[PDB]
């Protein structure tokens, strides 16, 4: 059962960078090694088959290599949206493995988050509770803090944006009925990079 | 042009028996293998094994032998995978995935096209299909929220998929009840608030409900 080793893990290159990607069989294998490419949301997709040759109409940036049980993949100069994960299969020997994958993230210059927030809906306070919503939109790097009061908000990320390379970022904050009713003013505290001063939107409600 | 188009996907009761179905269309089916991939969240791709629609046999996996059946279904263009005993780590996104090229070239040898995978999520608990509130808008920023629903996932579109620049579908969240929740919001002309409608579909297919919510100001 053929194990193929992948590496790096993952990498952050910069727009116009050239990336490696290795992966190294665990027993011999002939050519019969083939590169997907799979971008978030998406199925993988394949780039490079019989470890060389370009499937039709794939930006020839792209190379696969080889020496030994060693295969390279070559991005030769790398673009926003090449951000991906790629994977080896080798189809030599039943049943068919792929590697474990290598993250290409893209590194590029600092972006601000616009920030936007969301009162809670006249339709979902009827259920008893209260959701705000802080929106960061668009900001480069990945690191930035939410503040409202803790303990209640969750908050997630959007992938890397394969145009602009930043990111998103939903912070909700899911309080209770007439919890929320009794104060009034709500904000969101966005601290981040690219922006000088720590940035506040807010909503009295009413 | 060459669609795979997969459905099935839900939340399965761990042991239970769910039944998936890629539906393939844009060539003839008898000529090329259809197989399956499978993904867990977050993980590496392991193979399934394949079925030849011409001539119906099978190429196994011994590892999934005993649980797992492909088949395929030359009336209906439509390749099934059958899973049976199902347990908390076959919880994965499942691809079905052509073999090209033409024939068998000794030097090609792929999965060329693949359809959009589908997330058979098995679990004790049930399922509930999800509630999407509006979050109401130079630009201007409207979304909607979708929330208490399971199991993953929710596939969110804006007016029904002519809107896609802008869009932010952001990753569900687990609440500590156990529903998921997600948000997903759009950006827009203020110019145009007056004068263009702006809705979003929720379609939750793990309980064959999709909802749309016209977001207003």
């Known amino acids: 059962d053929i194990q193929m080793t992948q590496s790096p893990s993952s990498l952050s290159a910069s727009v116009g960078d050239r990336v490696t990607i290795t992966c190294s069989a665990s027993q011999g294998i002939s050519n019969y090694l083939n590169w997907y490419q799979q971008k978030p949301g998406k199925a993988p997709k394949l780039l490079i088959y019989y470890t060389s040759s370009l499937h039709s109409g794939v930006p020839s940036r792209f190379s696969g290599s080889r020496s030994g049980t060693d295969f390279t993949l070559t991005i030769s100069s790398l673009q926003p949206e090449d951000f991906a994960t790629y994977y080896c299969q080798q189809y030599s020997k039943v049943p068919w493995t792929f590697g474990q994958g290598t993250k290409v993230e893209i590194k590029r210059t600092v972006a601000a988050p616009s920030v936007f927030i969301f009162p809670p809906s006249d339709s979902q306070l009827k259920s008893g509770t209260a959701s705000v919503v802080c929106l960061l939109n668009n900001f480069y790097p990945r690191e930035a803090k939410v503040q409202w009061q803790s303990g209640n908000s969750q908050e997630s990320v959007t992938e890397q944006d394969s145009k602009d390379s930043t990111y998103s970022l939903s912070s909700t904050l899911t309080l209770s009925k007439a919890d929320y009713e009794k104060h009034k003013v709500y904000a969101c505290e966005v601290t981040h990079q690219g922006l000088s001063s720590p940035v506040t939107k807010s909503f009295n409600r009413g | 042009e060459v669609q795979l188009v997969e459905s099935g996907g839900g939340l399965v009761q761990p042991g239970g028996s769910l039944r998936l179905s890629c539906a393939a269309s844009?060539?003839?089916?008898?000529?090329?293998?259809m197989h399956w991939v499978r993904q867990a969240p977050g993980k590496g791709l392991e193979w399934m094994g394949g079925?030849?629609?011409?001539?119906?046999?099978?190429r196994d996996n011994q590892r999934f032998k005993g649980r797992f059946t492909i088949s395929a279904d030359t009336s209906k263009n439509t390749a099934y995978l059958q899973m049976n005993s199902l347990r908390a780590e076959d919880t994965a996104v499942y691809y079905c995935?052509?073999?090209?090229?033409?024939?068998?070239?000794?030097?090609?040898?792929?999965?060329?096209?693949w359809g959009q995978g589908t997330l058979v999520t098995v679990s004790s608990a049930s399922t509930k299909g999800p509630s999407v509130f509006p979050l109401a808008p130079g630009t201007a920023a409207l979304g909607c929220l979708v929330k208490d629903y399971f199991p993953e996932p929710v596939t969110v579109s804006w007016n029904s998929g002519a809107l896609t620049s802008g869009v932010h579908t952001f990753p569900a969240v687990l609440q500590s009840s156990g529903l998921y929740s997600l948000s997903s919001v759009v950006t827009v002309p203020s110019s145009s608030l007056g004068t263009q409608t702006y809705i979003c579909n929720v379609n939750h297919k793990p309980s064959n409900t999709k909802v749309d919510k016209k977001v207003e100001p």
């Open positions: 079925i030849n629609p011409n001539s119906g046999g099978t």
């Open positions: 995935a052509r073999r090209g090229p033409y024939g068998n070239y000794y030097n090609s040898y792929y999965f060329d096209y």
């Open positions: 844009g060539y003839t089916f008898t000529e090329y293998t």
